[PDB]
């Protein structure tokens, strides 16, 4: 049968963002036939792999439908002046220091080309999947950036999250960082998981499938390798916080 | 020919709205072909009439194809409680102290009803213009409620707005509050004007009418009586306030 891929929150972990396209690829051996691609940010910002993964999904929008949209932090790079000599103006953004420090290095790394590709980022999802239409945006309706769908809510707290957009069979978000799909008289409120953003401890990139057809989601797991991350992140001079992140979790 | 009349931020000035509406009315007389209507936000919120706006709305919806969403007031008073006995959480908003009057008394007057309605509106406008897909948004893209989009910029402004949603031809926001008309490589940034928020002095109901099929946007400027709405203001015990920004404008 045919399903729709949807990824959220590489957050620029490269080697999580592989093992998934990997997985995926297998799976289409085991009777699932995947037409097109969703893929909500963080593309990049936290973890030392920007240019490996704009890359990975350029190639993979050449041979299949992939329609991509910008996260929180793919919007701090974005919005910088496009002549600027440095990523200095990170510095004054109220954000935790090693935040300032790997947005720094994304913006750098990318170069004007990676940067100018996360200005070309759409910033609302609209589509359908089957014959259903469905809205997708990286943090809440009400606040595509900043906003925060949690995860473990009661249904009353999705229904009133989905009313705003109950012209829509599904609202795809990445905030809430876990696998979620709450129905409500709405709607349903689903949430892939994270790709390359670890939330707690044992990580396993996460994404889903869901069936054209019948809108029903599964979630899968795979499992990547943290240890040549932490490699890069060292490497690389980064914060030791984001190896922390890496193996403990931590919040966008 | 065909249009379809774009309006905003009524911000509860109901015979502001009237005056725009009969306007419409004459014009179609006069050989314009109203094929629909896009009311973007504020609905209610500074002026004294939110149930009458309302009804107006409504009863325009059952013989016209209507479609409306909600600005920054009315998320103000719909984010509240379905239950709550007062409008008291406004208080502890960090809003001028005028918009905690009018935003309450909107509140109580709205009723239980009233409040829902504004519940059920979209967010987000996604409608084609003949061939040409549109998108709308109060503020901005990049924010939907606190962003602020400005009028009289270089067009360079504007294409750096237009980017992330260069999917569709054409832009509507409410923000500018003034006649905005700019095209630029990844489409068109435009703003209706304001139906009944005064931006300045002299403040004339204004709102678009767009081709169906070339896109041109013709602005319309309507006179209404600003006396009745000052009385309605005294009468209802409101602020000052609302009557300078009545006759001087104010800002969202
Ligand atoms: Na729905
Ligand atoms: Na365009």
Redo the contacts with the bound molecule.
């Keep these: 049968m045919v399903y729709v891929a949807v990824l959220a929150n590489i957050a620029g972990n490269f080697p999580a963002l592989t093992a998934a396209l990997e997985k995926i690829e297998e799976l289409k051996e085991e009777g699932y036939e995947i037409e097109k691609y969703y893929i909500l940010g963080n593309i990049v910002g936290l973890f030392p792999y920007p240019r490996e993964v704009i890359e990975a999904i350029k190639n993979l929008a050449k041979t299949s439908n992939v329609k991509v949209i910008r996260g929180k932090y793919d919007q701090l790079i974005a919005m910088s002046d496009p002549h600027a000599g440095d990523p200095k103006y990170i510095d004054k953004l109220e954000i935790p220091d090693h935040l300032k420090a790997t947005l720094k290095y994304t913006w750098e790394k990318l170069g004007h080309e990676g940067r100018e590709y996360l200005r070309d980022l759409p910033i609302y999802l609209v589509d359908k999947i089957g014959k259903n239409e469905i809205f997708g945006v990286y943090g809440s309706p009400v606040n595509p950036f900043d906003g925060e769908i949690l995860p473990d809510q009661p249904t009353s707290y999705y229904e009133a999250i ?1 009313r705003p957009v ?4 599904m609202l795809l978000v990445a905030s809430p960082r876990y696998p979620l799909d709450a129905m409500t008289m ?2 349903r409120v689903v949430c892939p998981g994270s790709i390359g953003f670890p939330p707690a401890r044992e990580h396993k990139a996460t994404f889903a499938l869901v069936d054209a057809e019948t809108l029903k989601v599964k979630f899968i797991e795979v499992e990547y390798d943290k240890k040549i991350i932490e490699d890069r992140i060292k490497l690389e001079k980064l914060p030791e916080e984001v190896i922390k992140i890496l193996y403990h979790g931590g919040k966008a």
């Design positions: 989905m109950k012209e829509y069979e709405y709607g």
